[PDB]
Design a binder for this molecule. Structure first.
Ligand SMILES: CCCCCCCCCCCCCCCCCC(=O)OC[C@H](COP(=O)([O-])OCC(O)COP(=O)([O-])OC[C@@H](COC(=O)CCCCCCCCCCCCCCCCC)OC(=O)CCCCCCCCCCCCCCCCC)OC(=O)CCCCCCCCCCCCCCCCC
Ligand SMILES: CCCCCCCCCCCCCCCCCC(=O)OC[C@H](COP(=O)([O-])OCC(O)COP(=O)([O-])OC[C@@H](COC(=O)CCCCCCCCCCCCCCCCC)OC(=O)CCCCCCCCCCCCCCCCC)OC(=O)CCCCCCCCCCCCCCCCC
Ligand SMILES: CCCCCCCCCCCCCCCCCC(=O)OC[C@H](COP(=O)([O-])OCC(O)COP(=O)([O-])OC[C@@H](COC(=O)CCCCCCCCCCCCCCCCC)OC(=O)CCCCCCCCCCCCCCCCC)OC(=O)CCCCCCCCCCCCCCCCC
Ligand SMILES: CCCCCCCCCCCCCCCC(=O)O[C@H](COC(=O)CCCCCCC[C@@H](C)CCCCCCCCC)COP(=O)(O)O[C@H]1[C@H](O)[C@H](O)[C@@H](O)[C@@H](O)[C@@H]1O
Ligand SMILES: CCCCCCCC/C=C\CCCCCCCC(=O)OC[C@H](COP(=O)(O)OCCN)OC(=O)CCCCCCCCCCCCCCC
Ligand SMILES: CC(C)=CCC/C(C)=C/CC/C(C)=C/CC/C(C)=C/CC/C(C)=C/CC/C(C)=C/CC/C(C)=C/CC1=C(C)C(=O)c2ccccc2C1=O
Ligand code: HEC
Ligand code: HEC
Ligand code: HEM
Ligand code: HEM
Ligand code: FES
Lengths: 51, 53, 139, 223, 74, 185, 531
């Protein structure tokens, strides 16, 4: 049973997302999280179209 | 926000300086179950999530 | 049954006189000629009373006196069988609910609800009309 | 135009002053100010028939227009000249462009509608409910200029889509998608109102299940 | 818990619920309607609707309990 | 047979009330005929008096057949009643189809309920009469089914009599409305 | 020519497998002919449709979350970036002849499957067929109901469109994520990570075409095996007893009836799949986390869940550094409901102490408490279902959204109590009507005025008269109209337009009357002898 279910068990808190403060869990981060301590993140509208 | 209503803005502790004048930015993810709370009623300034109202 | 008829053509006579008087008094001495709404309604009120009175008069021309139309009648004269009166039925409430569904569908203009209410009306009227005529199940 | 402005003023003074103040500044607790709204706002309010209103409530509903096209143009000219703001796109002959507003790209109009608009009506603009008595109406019976001016001047609880937030080509794409979705027949059969699983379940319970139970009653026996 | 005079077909199936279940059910329903006044809403019309319905439920339970306690209702 | 039949008298009084309903519709029509100014019907309305006469004649024929079916049902012959009422049902259906066809041809020629006041009154009155005709057709179908489902008692004959009463009221109202619309104009 | 072939085939079959005794036992099995005993069969037949169409849909569906550009035939989505599952669903709807028809027949069959399972559950619950020895069969049925609900959920989640993707994100992600201790672990076991992952659709496809269908197939097999070898229940009647089954044998009445019902159900499903549109995916577009629609409702068998989440009032808990969100309530809600559905026979067995073998069903009026509870549960389910649809109700019927929300909130308390009270009184009143009929006789609707002025109604006694001797209630339905006892007579035989000669009418009517007397006499002799 352990060798069966164990392939599905994933730690949700394994730091996998880069951040200007190291590696952090997915649920703690989004695309707005800066990644090199001074990153310019623009608020971009979706034109719904190339670019 | 229309300036004629900017006096009505009450600001959260620790976020008093997150707006740039009349422009506020919030998440488009409902805090209940993650649906896009994407119904902006301007005359009531109400953000509405259609998944569970 | 002469009394009921006679009442109806009395109403007919008065209604016809009033309708003609209204038509004449509006054709001349009114602002825009005949009024065309009171006149129509009064003429067809005359028609309503006329139809009812004429049918009752044709019934009275074809009827020997009943106990209830006969003074000095004795209860024993009226003895016998009266007819069929429904002992119980729950179809009227269903017919009313169906017509209410249709009315709501046509108040808030929803053609699908109108069609559903109309189908429900046909079904409940069928149930009411067929209630004492459905035979025993075949099996 | 002097005649046009005078006709607009003589229409406004007998249809709008009781709520808008007779100098286009609002009546305190009847109506808002009318400075800056412009010809586009006037056209969308009157040509839709929403305006004049009659009751102060959660939302003013759409009605048959209370004037004609020329009178709507006169009122738009009046409110525009007294204030100043957005205008309706005109055509080569002085009217408002209807076919010219129909955009080419309908996939892009659909993407823009789903990102900006479908959140309040639905996927195909069939309408949706709002917080307190308000709602976003069904878009089917609205000509292109009304759609364009509703985007351009958000009336009430509609976000305002300026010409730089939604460019004219984007607005025309959205207009094209809305008209296409209104005018497209359902392919799978009878579209059950275009709302999804709710009419589908009602149809199953009232047609499929009713017919199935009736057939079972026919085949089976009582007692 | 019932007689043939009250429920004719009593021998045929489950036909009685103890009145305690109904009384505590009414009290709990009233408590739920009351506790729904704590939450997130600006307006207070719904609070008065909840109070009115809770009052009706408590009045019904109180009358039923009183009449069974005095003997009229059984 | 020394007493009156109450289903008949109830049907008669209710038919008189329905006559009053059509009185309301006639009052709607006559007004706005006097406001047009003589251009009645106004353009682009051109009454198709070549299809309206045939449906009127078919309605009169259906009334005759319905009375013949009443004659059949008065002597207890359920099958003759069924035949005459099926014929009446088919011819009333033809009348409804002709009315719909004239509706279609008129709407195609710019005459609609929102289009004009004449259109408003004309379609209102004629459509309500058509709804009454459709109700009569439903009554015919229900009566035929009831005759199919039980032995033909005098109660069935009474039901057929009152259904024919309703049909006679309907086509008399249509005669009046045809004379008012396509003749007086 | 075929008689010799039949005889030779039967001889070969008997010489090789000797099935004669068993086949004869299965052909002589007696099934009662009540209409409600057909309800379960609907859930069977639709399921078979769900298999058939399902296999068809497996020949064209690619359940990949990989993102591609459409370049299909549907113009209003040309150049739109979508998942591979959405594109293949579009290809089914537009590029395969009859693909739209198969999709719609499949979705309609799913809806009928759910609805017929619900109606069959209502029949089983109100008739008391869950009683001993049929408790495990109720457990199996409840498991089948839950499995069908989740199977349909996964099914319409398969094409990754805006509506189904929004439903996935709301329910299967938000509720799972918020569970107290293992919620995020469950979410990352199921999705393989965060919600907008890459493995969800293939996993749901595998669960939905193979795993859940296999479990449901095995459970339906065990279910029908139990029903077959635990012979069907029956209602109390003339010839009925706890120790017998009265009905028709399998060959040929029951087999032909079941086959014809299958054909008619297939006809209804085909007509609905052709003439009615269901799930027009191409109008919704590909799923995008940044977009949503106003009309966000699942298929109806899940709607109640959303209604619960719409009505429960934002009650959250904050223990030491931890959050227990509102969605947890919803989960518990569902759990409790499912629990309360699985163990109902044992709950009633404990409460009433009734642990006796039961083969004769109960009329719902004879069990007012259980009927009241069932009406209460149905009222609550309907209220939650409509509270799920309160945005559409608000839009179409002019009512504010907050009004429908508060009506639902107050109703989920007030309405079940009113419905319980009304159902209880209504059941007892139906009992009283039965007793009135049994004690005075059927009211014929005929009124006579006696010579002294007495208006009396003619009563038709159902038994002998001394005024009738009052008969004893025997758990069976009673006639209350005289046309149902044969008083309405028979119409003249013919073709609805032309009569047959009176000799044929006499022969047929006399033969039918003789047959009816013979059948009633046979039932009377069997009843008298056995008792
Ligand atoms: C828009 C959504 C809403 C619309 C509805 C949705 C779709 C509706 C589905 C309808 C399908 C029903 C079954 C279809 C199969 C046909 C069955 C059949 O042929 O047997 C005759 C069947 C009686 O068979 P039986 O087994 O011998 O009856 C045993 C007892 O003697 C019977 O004695 P009883 O007293 O117990 O029966 C009481 C009941 C008889 O009905 C029943 O008992 C069965 C329940 C069905 C009632 C109708 C409900 C449909 C709407 C809800 O009486 C009624 O309620 C009359 C209702 C008739 C309505 C028909 C008009 C609808 C047209 C709409 C336009 O008659 C009916 O039940 C109704 C006939 C209407 C079906 C139309 C096509 C068949 C015409 C038969 C011509 C001969
Ligand atoms: C605006 C337009 C209007 C249009 C509409 C037009 C209509 C006109 C309206 C005006 C009509 C005027 C009157 C009409 C005639 C009515 C009079 C008549 O005919 O009868 C005479 C009528 C007879 O009443 P009575 O003399 O009191 O005798 C009562 C019976 O004997 C009762 O005998 P009993 O002792 O056996 O009673 C049984 C039990 C009644 O039993 C029940 O009702 C309980 C219902 C549910 C049972 C528990 C659940 C089932 C167990 C499952 C779970 C197990 C755990 O008693 C109670 O407990 C009553 C309190 C109810 C509390 C229950 C509330 C919550 C229930 C818990 C359910 C929770 C929901 C769970 C869902 C999950 C939520 C998450 O006499 C009266 O007129 C009394 C007046 C009414 C008193 C009102 C005073 C209160 C102040 C004003 C309100
Ligand atoms: C819209 C729906 C209605 C809502 C609006 C209601 C407006 C409120 C009006 C209040 C009426 C006050 C006048 C009656 C005083 C009742 C006391 C009494 O009569 O004592 C005699 C009674 C005589 O003793 P007994 O000899 O043993 O009785 C044997 C006789 O057979 C005793 O005879 P009985 O057993 O046959 O019953 C008589 C007596 C005893 O029964 C009781 O237990 C009454 C207890 C509650 C009655 C209402 C008072 C509280 C109402 C709350 C406010 C609601 C708003 O009182 C009643 O049951 C009369 C109530 C219903 C009368 C009308 C019923 C149908 C007509 C309605 C027309 C159509 C419907 C539309 C509504 C229109 C209304 C105008 O002494 C008692 O102790 C009985 C009282 C039992 C106390 C238990 C606790 C009850 C729970 C009430 C607490 C409510 C909370 C307060 C709300 C706070 C929130 C702001
Ligand atoms: C099984 C019977 C089904 C027969 C199907 C067999 C027919 C064969 C071919 C079918 C082809 C499809 C039919 C026409 C193709 C078609 O779809 O036609 C729609 C029309 O729909 C309507 O309303 C018309 C309603 C009249 C239909 C009445 C039948 C409905 C039944 C099925 C409902 C019974 C269940 C009742 C439920 C409740 C009962 C319980 C209380 C467009 O209406 P539209 O005028 O453009 O407005 C819309 C708006 O949503 C909006 O205005 C929008 O702006 C527009 O874009 C358009 O969507
Ligand atoms: C209520 C009074 C009913 C009268 C029956 C007369 C029907 C006769 C049909 C008249 C034909 C017509 O006039 O169609 C022209 C206009 C279109 O205008 P359009 O756009 O310019 O033309 C098209 C260009 N594409 O139809 C319309 O407005 C829509 C008329 C639809 C009539 C619906 C019937 C309502 C049924 C009432 C049921 C009552 C239930 C309540 C129970 C208490
Ligand atoms: C929750 C609540 C209180 C709602 C009240 C709104 C309402 C119906 C008010 C009516 C006024 C009242 C209260 C009248 C009382 C008198 C009575 C008893 C009337 C009975 C008739 C009623 C209540 C009818 C309403 C039935 C009803 C609400 C059904 C649910 C609505 C549903 C499921 C709509 C689904 C549905 C939609 C939305 C379509 O667009 C569509 C388009 C094309 C074909 C089919 C459909 C379809 O089925
Ligand atoms: C009182 C019943 C009013 C009458 C008379 C007129 N208007 Fe109005 N208007 C009124 C309200 C309460 C509102 C805002 C809320 C709403 O339901 O719309 C408005 C709004 C407008 C607007 C839009 C303003 C904006 O910022 O978008 C316009 C352009 C407008 N009103 C014009 C207008 C015209 C032309 C009128 C005469 C036909 C008129 N209003 C009358 C209230 C009332
Ligand atoms: C918030 C919810 C929105 C958003 C994001 C959009 N719309 Fe709509 N809309 C909304 C409301 C409350 C109203 C009512 C207008 C009023 O009460 O004065 C409308 C109206 C429209 C209309 C007019 C429909 C008609 O009168 O026939 C149209 C054509 C329309 N809305 C379209 C539309 C488009 C194209 C949008 C995306 C740019 C869009 N809406 C968004 C509410 C809301
Ligand atoms: C896929 C789901 C289901 C299928 C295919 C199914 C099918 C059937 C069929 C065909 C019968 C025999 C005929 C009948 O009783 O109508 C039956 C009987 C039964 N079912 Fe179901 N059913 C399902 C769900 C349920 C549910 C939800 C319950 C609760 C349940 C409990 C029972 C019981 C107790 C019986 C025995 C009836 C008796 O003995 O009288 N089943 N089922
Ligand atoms: C109780 C059994 C089942 C239920 C309730 C059910 C329900 C559904 C529903 C509602 C859909 C949505 C279809 C649409 O919206 O277009 C769906 C999709 C699908 N079903 Fe099923 N299904 C069942 C069994 C099966 C089986 C047994 C198979 C395969 C043998 C299958 C194959 C599919 C496939 C491949 C899809 C996705 C393709 C598409 O959506 O067009 N289903 N299912
Ligand atoms: S996800 Fe927004 S309210 Fe539920």
């Amino acid at each position: 049973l352990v060798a069966f279910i164990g392939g599905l068990i994933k730690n949700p808190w394994k730091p996998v997302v880069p951040t200007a403060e190291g590696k952090k869990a997915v649920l703690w981060t989004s695309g707005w999280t800066p990644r090199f301590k001074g990153e310019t993140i623009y608020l971009a509208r979706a034109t719904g179209r190339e670019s | 926000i229309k300036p004629a209503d900017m006096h009505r803005v009450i600001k959260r502790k620790g976020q008093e300086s997150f707006n740039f004048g009349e422009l506020f930015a919030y998440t488009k993810v409902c805090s209940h179950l993650g649906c896009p709370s994407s119904l902006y009623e301007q005359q009531t300034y109400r953000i509405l999530c259609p998944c569970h109202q | 049954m002469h009394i009921e008829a006679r009442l109806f053509e009395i109403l007919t006579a008065f209604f016809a006189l009033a309708a003609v008087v209204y038509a004449v008094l509006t054709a001349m001495f009114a602002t825009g000629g005949v009024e065309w709404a009171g006149t129509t309604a009064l003429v067809l009120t005359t028609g309503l009373t006329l139809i009812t009175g004429t049918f009752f008069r044709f019934v009275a021309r074809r009827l020997d006196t009943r106990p209830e139309d006969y003074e000095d009648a004795e209860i024993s004269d009226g003895a016998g069988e009266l007819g069929f009166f429904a002992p119980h039925s729950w179809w009227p409430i269903l017919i009313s609910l169906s017509f209410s569904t249709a009315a709501v569908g046509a108040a808030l203009w929803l053609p699908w609800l109108i069609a559903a209410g109309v189908a429900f009306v046909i079904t409940s009227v069928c149930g009411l009309v067929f209630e004492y005529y459905w035979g025993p199940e075949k099996h | 135009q002097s005649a046009l402005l005078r006709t607009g003023k003589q229409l406004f003074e007998t249809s709008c002053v009781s709520c808008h103040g007779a100098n286009l500044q609002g009546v305190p607790d009847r109506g808002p100010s009318l400075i800056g709204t412009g010809e586009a706002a006037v056209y969308f309010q009157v040509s839709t028939g929403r305006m004049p209103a009659m009751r102060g409530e959660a939302q003013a509903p759409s009605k048959p227009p209370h004037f004609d096209e020329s009178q709507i143009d006169a009122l738009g000219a009046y409110v525009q000249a007294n204030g100043g703001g957005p205008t309706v796109p005109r055509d080569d002959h002085g009217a408002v462009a209807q076919e010219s507003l129909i955009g080419g790209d309908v996939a892009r109009g659909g993407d823009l509608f789903r990102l900006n608009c479908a959140s309040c009506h639905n996927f195909t603009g069939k309408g949706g409910a709002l917080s307190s008595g308000k709602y976003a109406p069904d878009l089917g019976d609205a000509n292109p200029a009304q759609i364009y001016t509703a985007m351009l001047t958000g009336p009430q609880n509609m976000p305002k889509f300026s010409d730089r937030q939604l460019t004219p080509d984007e607005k025309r794409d959205i207009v094209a998608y809305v008209r296409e979705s209104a005018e497209t027949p359902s392919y799978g059969g009878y579209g059950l109102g275009g709302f999804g699983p709710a009419p589908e379940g009602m149809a199953m319970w009232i047609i499929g299940m009713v017919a199935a139970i009736g057939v079972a009653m026919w085949i089976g026996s009582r007692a | 818990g019932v007689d043939v005079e009250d429920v004719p077909s009593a021998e045929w199936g489950w036909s009685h619920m103890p009145i305690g279940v109904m009384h505590i059910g009414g009290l709990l329903s009233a408590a739920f309607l009351l506790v729904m006044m704590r939450g997130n809403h600006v307006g207070h019309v719904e609070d008065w609707f909840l109070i009115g319905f809770a009052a009706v439920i408590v009045a019904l339970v109180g009358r039923n309990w009183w009449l069974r306690r005095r003997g009229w209702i059984r | 047979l020394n007493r009156p039949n109450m289903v008949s008298v109830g049907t008669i009084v209710w038919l008189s009330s329905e006559l009053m309903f059509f009185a309301g519709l006639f009052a709607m029509y006559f007004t706005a005929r006097a406001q047009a100014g003589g251009a009645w019907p106004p353009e682009p309305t051109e009454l198709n008096l070549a299809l309206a006469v045939p449906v009127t004649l078919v309605l009169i024929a259906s009334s005759f057949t319905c009375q013949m079916g009443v004659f059949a049902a008065e002597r207890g012959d359920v099958f003759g009643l069924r035949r005459w009422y099926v014929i009446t049902f088919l011819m009333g259906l033809f009348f409804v189809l002709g009315q719909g066809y004239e509706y279609i041809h008129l709407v195609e020629h710019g005459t609609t309920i929102p289009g004009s006041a004449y259109g408003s009154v004309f379609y209102l009155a004629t459509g309500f009469h058509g709804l009454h005709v459709i109700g009569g057709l439903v009554a015919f179908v229900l009566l035929l089914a009831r005759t199919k489902m039980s032995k033909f008692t005098p109660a069935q004959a009474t039901a057929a009599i009152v259904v024919s009463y309703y049909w006679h009221f309907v086509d008399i109202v249509w005669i009046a409305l045809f004379a008012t619309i396509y003749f007086v104009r | 020519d075929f008689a010799k072939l039949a005889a030779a085939q039967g001889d070969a079959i008997d010489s090789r497998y000797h099935p004669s005794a068993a086949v004869r036992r299965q052909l002589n099995k007696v099934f009662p002919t009540h209409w409600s005993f057909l309800l379960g069969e609907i859930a069977l037949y639709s399921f078979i449709i769900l298999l058939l169409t399902g296999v068809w849909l497996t020949l064209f569906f690619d359940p990949s979350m990989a993102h591609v550009t459409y370049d299909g035939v549907y113009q209003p989505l040309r150049g739109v970036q979508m998942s591979r599952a959405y594109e293949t669903a579009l290809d089914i709807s537009f590029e395969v002849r009859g693909g739209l028809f198969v999709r719609q027949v499949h979705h309609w069959a799913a809806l009928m499957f759910a609805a017929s399972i619900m109606v069959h559950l209502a029949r089983i619950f109100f008739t008391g067929a869950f009683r001993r020895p049929r408790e495990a069969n109720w457990v199996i049925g409840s498991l089948l109901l839950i499995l069908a609900m989740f199977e349909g959920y996964f099914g319409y989640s398969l094409p990754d469109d805006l509506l189904s993707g929004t439903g996935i994100r709301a329910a299967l992600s938000g509720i799972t994520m918020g569970m107290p201790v293992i919620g995020t672990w469950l979410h990352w076991a199921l999705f393989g990570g965060d919600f907008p992952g890459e493995i969800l659709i293939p996993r749901l496809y595998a669960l939905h075409i193979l795993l859940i269908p296999g479990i449901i197939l095995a459970l339906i097999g065990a279910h029908l095996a139990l029903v077959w070898f635990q012979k069907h229940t029956q209602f109390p009647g003339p010839g009925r007893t706890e120790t017998n089954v009265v009905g028709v044998r399998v060959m040929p009445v029951f087999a032909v009836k079941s086959g014809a019902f299958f054909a008619m159900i297939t006809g209804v499903l085909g007509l609905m799949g052709g003439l009615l549109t269901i799930n027009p995916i191409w109008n919704l577009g590909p799923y995008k986390p940044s977009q949503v629609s106003a009309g966000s409702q699942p298929d109806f068998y899940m709607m109640w869940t959303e209604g619960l989440a719409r009505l429960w009032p934002a009650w959250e808990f904050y223990p030491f550094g931890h959050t227990i969100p509102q969605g947890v309530w919803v989960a518990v809600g569902m759990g409790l409901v499912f629990a309360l559905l699985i163990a109902y026979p044992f709950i009633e067995k404990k409460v009433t102490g009734d642990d006796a073998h039961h083969n004769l069903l109960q009329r719902p009026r004879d069990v007012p408490v259980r009927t009241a509870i069932g009406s209460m549960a149905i009222a609550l389910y309907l209220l939650l279902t409509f509270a799920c649809m309160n945005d559409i109700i608000a839009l179409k019927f002019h009512i504010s959204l907050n009004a429908t929300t508060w009506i639902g909130r107050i109703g989920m308390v007030v309405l079940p109590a009113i419905v319980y009270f009304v159902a209880y009184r209504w059941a007892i009143s139906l009992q009283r009507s039965d007793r009135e009929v049994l004690e005075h006789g059927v009211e014929t609707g005929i009124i006579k005025r006696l010579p002294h002025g007495a208006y009396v109604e003619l009563h038709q006694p159902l038994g002998p008269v001394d005024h009738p001797i009052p008969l004893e209630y025997a758990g069976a339905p009673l006639p209350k109209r005289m046309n149902k006892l044969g008083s309405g007579g028979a119409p003249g035989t013919g073709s609805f337009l032309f009569p047959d000669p009176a000799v044929e009418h006499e022969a047929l009517t006399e033969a039918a009357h003789a047959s009816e007397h013979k059948s009633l006499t046979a039932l009377k002799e069997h009843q008298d002898r056995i008792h």
